């Protein structure tokens, strides 16, 4: 079917201009559909921003004023979003979607791309291993984990053993502090398996272009 994917810088300095791209595949954007941009603020409040249709029809949210501009490129099949003079107030996750006449969107939404407006500098995260200090009642489960600390801005994706281990995994919401994010993730496996079979955690921080893999070893 159809697929939409938003891309763009996850960090913008206040006063500046924000710019995101939504690349469609499997379907042409030069169709009479409302190719729209929507955003979700911290608190989960959802807001409609605007849309471009039939390549030359654009409508916008009165409230964004005249700092919003929605354009496209038929050759590459992508429409763009541009928002002038952004303030922290604009920090949020941006989703592109395809609405039709009757408000139906189907499964035609992008994965959303997080944008943060701030003056702070991008800082990659430091990954630390969480092993058990001592032993415990084996012949059951063992819980290991990773600690991601001091990264800016959101987000960071954590996967275990390159993603080939998804059950028994728990990744917690990042908490802010001194304008620096920190979060943890746990994973639980049969004691009989660790540390024989090694267990790593991968942390990718797109904002800084870094990816870390950390093996959890016995202390």
């Amino acid at each position: 079917e159809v697929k939409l994917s938003e891309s763009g810088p996850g960090l913008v300095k206040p006063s500046q201009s924000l710019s995101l791209t939504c690349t469609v595949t499997g379907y042409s954007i030069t169709t009479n559909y409302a190719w729209t941009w929507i955003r979700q603020f911290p608190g989960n409040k959802l807001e409609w921003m605007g849309y471009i249709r039939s390549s030359v029809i654009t409508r916008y949210n009165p409230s964004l004023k005249s700092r919003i501009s929605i354009t496209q490129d038929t050759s590459k099949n992508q429409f763009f979003l541009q928002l002038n003079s952004v303030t922290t107030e604009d920090t949020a996750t941006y989703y592109c979607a395809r609405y039709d006449y009757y408000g139906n969107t189907g499964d035609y939404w992008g994965q959303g791309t997080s944008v943060t407006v701030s003056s702070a500098k991008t800082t990659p995260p430091s990954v630390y291993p969480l092993a058990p200090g001592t032993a415990a009642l084996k012949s059951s489960m063992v819980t290991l984990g990773c600690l991601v600390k001091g990264y800016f801005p959101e987000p960071v994706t954590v996967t275990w053993n390159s993603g080939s281990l998804s059950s028994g995994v728990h990744t917690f919401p990042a908490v802010l502090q001194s304008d620096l994010y920190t979060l943890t993730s746990s994973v639980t496996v049969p004691s009989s398996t660790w540390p024989s079979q090694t267990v790593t955690c991968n942390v990718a921080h797109p904002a800084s272009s870094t990816k870390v893999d950390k093996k959890i070893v016995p202390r």
Partner: protein, 216 residues
């Protein structure tokens, strides 16, 4: 413009029962064509919204027949027959009659399940973090129900409240449970000054607090 109000549910519901979510508009959403433009979406933790119903009572494609909408021109209801654990998340309604296409504040759905006691795991600072001058102690309290929980840290037996940061997850879509991680962060020189560090969790599933601990 139009103001859409969503009411919160008063209590977690029982699996296999019928649930109703309500949304109200300060302006009628009926259009000159006789159609009522209201959309219902479900958004699960870490996902993009998902259209469920549109045109007030029409099922999006590939959506369970357990979901259905009804209403007037200003009062709407999403009915979920035989609610399943995979249905938790946040339900929003959107008006599609006039600019801007206003969204609803959202309604959260919680599933009732068997009370489970937390699985506590405490971990000490990594040699990597310590060679940095920092030191954090982590404690995971996994897969418990209900969500109400209280954690308490103690250094050398004495209660501590400075440096702790808690992060609760949302209700699991498979086993309906909740999980929390508490992190006690102190400076390295401070950590080398104490020997005992304990994590104490007080849940309804027991009078006595589950206490995990270690000694430097």
């Amino acid at each position: 413009d139009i103001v859409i109000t969503q009411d919160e549910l008063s209590n977690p519901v029982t699996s296999g029962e019928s649930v109703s979510i309500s949304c109200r508009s300060s302006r009628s959403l009926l259009y000159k064509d006789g159609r009522t433009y209201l959309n219902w979406f479900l958004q699960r933790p870490g996902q993009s919204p998902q259209l469920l119903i549109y045109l007030m009572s029409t099922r999006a494609s590939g959506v369970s027949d357990r979901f259905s909408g009804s209403g007037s021109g200003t009062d709407f209801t999403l009915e979920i027959s035989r609610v399943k654990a995979e249905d938790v998340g946040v339900y929003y309604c959107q008006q599609f009659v006039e600019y801007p296409f206003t969204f609803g504040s959202g309604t959260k759905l919680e599933i009732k399940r068997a009370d489970a006691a937390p699985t506590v795991s405490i971990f000490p600072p990594s040699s990597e973090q310590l060679t940095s001058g920092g030191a954090s102690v982590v404690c995971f309290l996994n897969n418990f129900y209900p969500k109400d929980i209280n954690v308490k840290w103690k250094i050398d037996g004495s209660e501590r409240q400075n440096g702790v940061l808690n992060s609760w997850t949302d209700q699991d879509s498979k086993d309906s449970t909740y999980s929390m991680s508490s992190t006690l962060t102190l400076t390295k020189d401070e950590y080398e000054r104490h020997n005992s560090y304990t994590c104490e969790a007080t849940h309804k599933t027991s009078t006595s607090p589950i206490v995990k601990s270690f000694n430097r």
